Amino acid sequence: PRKLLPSLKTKKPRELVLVIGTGISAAVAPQVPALKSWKGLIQALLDAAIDFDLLEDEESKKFQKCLHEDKNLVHVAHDLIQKLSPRTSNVRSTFFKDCLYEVFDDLESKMEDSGKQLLQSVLHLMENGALVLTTNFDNLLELYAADQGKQLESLDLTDEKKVLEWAQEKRKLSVLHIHGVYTNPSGIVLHPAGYQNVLRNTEVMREIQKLYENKSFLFLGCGWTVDDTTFQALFLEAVKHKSDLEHFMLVRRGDVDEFKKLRENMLDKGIKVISYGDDYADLPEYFKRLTCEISTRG
Amino acid sequence: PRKLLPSLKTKKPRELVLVIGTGISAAVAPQVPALKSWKGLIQALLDAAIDFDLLEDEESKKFQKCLHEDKNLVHVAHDLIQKLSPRTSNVRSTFFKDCLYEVFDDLESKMEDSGKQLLQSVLHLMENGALVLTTNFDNLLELYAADQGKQLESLDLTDEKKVLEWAQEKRKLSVLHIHGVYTNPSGIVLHPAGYQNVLRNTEVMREIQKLYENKSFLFLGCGWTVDDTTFQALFLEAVKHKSDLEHFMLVRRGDVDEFKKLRENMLDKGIKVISYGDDYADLPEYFKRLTCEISTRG
């Protein structure tokens, strides 16, 4: 198989900042449309909007029409967010709560060991002291973290005190959601202009330079992530040094052409490349070894 | 066994300049491919390149193809160096660092007393004040030198100031690597034209005559180093006196024919022959005696 990663073995778990994307959510049993892919997310919220009649026939037809010939997924998800927000004050919004909390539940009932190893290694990293952020609305990881008895809370960008106090890292055992959480419907912001107004403080992205300048990330199930504008604006807007980065990322192998294409474009971004077997079943053993040597040397 | 060397006994250890080659690295437990033989080094790098996918299948196939029907081993190692160097600026080159630092580690875990006596007597020679240079990429000797508490630095030909102040022998307790070191990936140069441009100063090779003209070397695990072109380029190009040399070299005995052919050819070069017992086990006692008598008379 693929042996121990050269750099990863010697990095301290403190500097390790794990990032989880659609790959880990797809490691969970793929029967919920929300977790197979990002495309199946918007399809899931569609099916939830049609069956719960939040949205009349013609405009569900429009949003479906976006699906076949598609472009600009994040804008379309934002157009959705905007059209489902005519609410007055709170009114326990049935246009929001009763769609996201329909789509993103029924998740635990389809949990197996093959995805379970991922988050148990994650709990090993957190008990080492590693910081973790995610890119999905789901909340399965911290639910099963609470399953064995480790309380893990969901954070967002709306709560200013928690974001301000989270950048300095004193609050360990905490996972920030760069997109949102279904357990807190008022805490999701996705449009590019929505996370800029709450981040009006230029001193608080001075407090985020400690993530990208010095701390080491590890993008799991990513790569299309570095393509959309959210990570460019939260990571690469306020830093001009691509010559000396310490960030890492893990994806599948496959056809050699896109292999070298991703190689070159995220060397231009400045992350290291790791592709191992595209077998969908050697990532568990490889990543759980990674975590255990990290914990032992840590 | 083989008693004390007639000439060596009376040499003061300052005149002694120890050279270590593939024999000492093979004295270490021979299960890393890198240290059993020079041949074994390039296959270790080839195996590292295949499993980490620096080169595609066909390039690795060509590289494998040179192995079976071989020639120009240093030339092929340079071809490997050139094709693994498309990097931009530094970019913590994954084509170099993540290959050499994979191959040349996992070395200390296989360290035993039979190889330990060699380096511990080496430490004796250093505390006498002898000079030592190496011909292999490894840094096991300096690592275990630092094990008991003696700090030993790895030097190369790239840093011009260190090489300039090193030829005078003002800097003691220092070891240059005629080939390179794995702890400094940017400090390795092997192709014949690489160590001439950095050595553009003919006055600095005039500062090198004090090695070959007056200082006494002692080549351990050598004999094939006087066959390739690096030793001839750095030693015999600027020296025209083979009538009066003062240099030594130690190797195995064996077939009498090959014994006398090496005898004659390196008498033509101008070194003394010592072949003892090819038992792979009386070199420790013989060389450790040699070193203790030199230290006592030093």
- The string of DSSP codes covering B155-206 is E-SS-HHHHHHHHTT-S-SEEEESS--TT-GGG---STTHHHHTT--HHHHH
Helix axes A73-83, A38-51, angle to 10 degrees: 30
Question: What's the gap between Cα B49 and its chain centre?
Answer: 24
Q: Is B149 exposed, middle or buried (0-12, 13-18, 19+ CB in 10 A)?
A: exposed
Structural domain boundaries of chain B? 8-31+111-297, 33-103
This entry's atomic model was obtained through cryo-EM
How far is residue B51's CA from residue B44's CA, in Å, rounded to a whole number? Answer: 11
Residues of B in contact with A272 (CB under 8 A): 92, 94, 98
Q: What tokens appear for A270 in the block?
A: 């400045």
How far is residue B191's CA from residue B195's CA, in Å, rounded to a whole number? Answer: 7
How far is residue B58's CA from residue A58's CA, in Å, rounded to a whole number? Answer: 55
How far is residue A217's CA from residue A132's CA, in Å, rounded to a whole number? Answer: 9
Q: What tokens appear for A266 in the block?
A: 């995220």
Query: First and final CA of chain A: distance in angstroms?
Result: 24
Q: What tokens appear for A69 in the block?
A: 């010939």
**Rounded to the nearest 5°, which phi and psi values hold at A27?**
-65, -35
Q: Do B94 and A273 touch (CB under 8 A)?
A: yes
Q: How many CB atoms lie within 10 A of CB B112?
A: 10
Q: For residue B173, give Cα distances in angstroms to A194, B109, B128.
A: 61, 25, 10
Query: First and final CA of chain B: distance in angstroms?
Result: 24
Q: Kindly identify which residue of chain A lies nearest to residue B98, measuring between CA atoms.
A: A6
Query: How does DSSP classify residue B109?
Result: G
Rg of the Cα atoms in chain B: 19
Residues of A in contact with B91 (CB under 8 A): 243, 267, 270
Q: Kindly identify which residue of chain A lies nearest to residue B94, measuring between CA atoms.
A: A272
Q: What tokens appear for B63 in the block?
A: 């590289």
Residues of B in contact with A2 (CB under 8 A): 51
How far is residue A281's CA from residue B23's CA, in Å, rounded to a whole number? Answer: 43
How far is residue A16's CA from residue B198's CA, in Å, rounded to a whole number? Answer: 40
Contact with chain B for residue A124, Cβ under 8 A: no
Q: Given the structure tokens 């659609």, which residue do they identify? A: A22
Q: What is the CATH architecture of B8-31+111-297?
A: 3-Layer(aba) Sandwich (3.40)
Closest alpha carbon to A249 in A223, A224, A267: A223
Q: Taking a C-beta distance cutoff of 8 angstroms, is the pair A98, A51 a contact? A: no
The answer for B 63-102 residues in CB contact with A (under 8 A) is: 88-92, 94, 97-98, 101-102
CA distance A236 to chain B (A): 17
Q: Do A6 and B102 touch (CB under 8 A)?
A: yes
How far is residue A249's CA from residue A74's CA, in Å, rounded to a whole number? Answer: 22
How far is residue A83's CA from residue A70's CA, in Å, rounded to a whole number? Answer: 19
Q: What tokens appear for B118 in the block?
A: 């060699």
Q: Taking a C-beta distance cutoff of 8 angstroms, is the pair A48, A99 a contact? A: yes
Closest alpha carbon to A140 in A194, A169, A177, A170: A177
**Rounded to the nearest 5°, which phi and psi values hold at B192?**
-55, -35
Q: For residue B235, give Cα distances in angstroms to A239, B82, B192, B265.
A: 50, 25, 13, 16
Q: Kindly identify which residue of chain A lies nearest to residue B57, measuring between CA atoms.
A: A256
Q: Do B53 and A275 touch (CB under 8 A)?
A: yes
Question: What's the gap between Cα B139 and its chain centre?
Answer: 11
**Rounded to the nearest 5°, which phi and psi values hold at B18?**
-80, 135
Identify the bridge partners of residue B176 per DSSP, sorted by sequence position: B133, B155
Closest alpha carbon to B117 in B244, B251, B296, B292: B292
Q: Do B53 and A3 touch (CB under 8 A)?
A: no
Q: Taking a C-beta distance cutoff of 8 angstroms, is the pair A168, A180 a contact? A: no
How far is residue A142's CA from residue B197's CA, in Å, rounded to a whole number? Answer: 60
Residues of A in contact with B92 (CB under 8 A): 244, 272
For the CA atoms of B279, B285, B286, B291, what is the dihedral angle to 10 degrees?
150
Closest alpha carbon to A204 in A172, A164, A149, A236: A164
Closest alpha carbon to B187 in B225, B145, B158, B146: B158
Q: Taking a C-beta distance cutoff of 8 angstroms, is the pair B45, B246 a contact? A: no
Q: Do A6 and B97 touch (CB under 8 A)?
A: yes
Residues of A in contact with B94 (CB under 8 A): 272-273
Bridging pattern class, strands B131-134 and B153-155: unpaired
Q: Do B51 and A2 touch (CB under 8 A)?
A: yes
Identify the bridge partners of residue B177 per DSSP, sorted by sequence position: B134
Tell me the DSSP string of chain A: -----TTTTTS-GGGEEEEE-HHHHHHS-TTSHHHH-HHHHHHHHHHHHHHTTSS-HHHHHHHHHHHHS---HHHHHHHHHHHT----S-TT-TTTHHHHHHHT-S-GGG--HHHHHHHHHHHHHHHHT-EEEESSS--HHHHHHHHHT---EEE-SS-HHHHHHHTT--S-SEEEESS--SS-GGG---STTHHHHTT--HHHHHTTHIIIIISEEEEES-SSGGGSHHHIIIIISS----SS---EEEB----HHHHHHHHHHHHHHT----B--S-SSHHHHHHHHHHHHHHHH-
Closest alpha carbon to A180 in A159, A166, A152: A159
Closest alpha carbon to B43 in B71, B72, B75, B66: B66
Q: Taking a C-beta distance cutoff of 8 angstroms, is the pair B29, B115 a contact? A: yes
Query: How does DSSP classify residue B230?
Result: H
Resolution (A): 4.8
User: What is the largest distance, in Å, between two alpha-carbon atoms of chain A?
Assistant: 59
What residues contact A144, with CB distance under 8 A and at least 6 apart?
A108, A111, A116, A119
Side-chain-side CA neighbours of B72 within 13 Å: the count stands at 9
For the CA atoms of A254, A258, A261, A266, what is the dihedral angle to 10 degrees?
-60
Q: Taking a C-beta distance cutoff of 8 angstroms, is the pair A7, B98 a contact? A: yes
Picking from A3, A7, A256, the nearest residue to B51 by CB comes out as: A3
Q: Taking a C-beta distance cutoff of 8 angstroms, is the pair B144, B188 a contact? A: no
Side-chain-side CA neighbours of A273 within 13 Å: the count stands at 22
CA distance B46 to chain A (A): 15
How far is residue A197's CA from residue A261's CA, in Å, rounded to a whole number? Answer: 35
Q: Which of A7, A247, A260 to mutate to test the interface with B (most CBs of B within 10 A)?
A: A7
Tell me the DSSP string of B235-275: IISS----SS--BEEEB----HHHHHHHHHHHHHHTB---B
Q: How many CB atoms lie within 10 A of CB A179?
A: 19
Q: What tokens appear for B88 in the block?
A: 């931009």
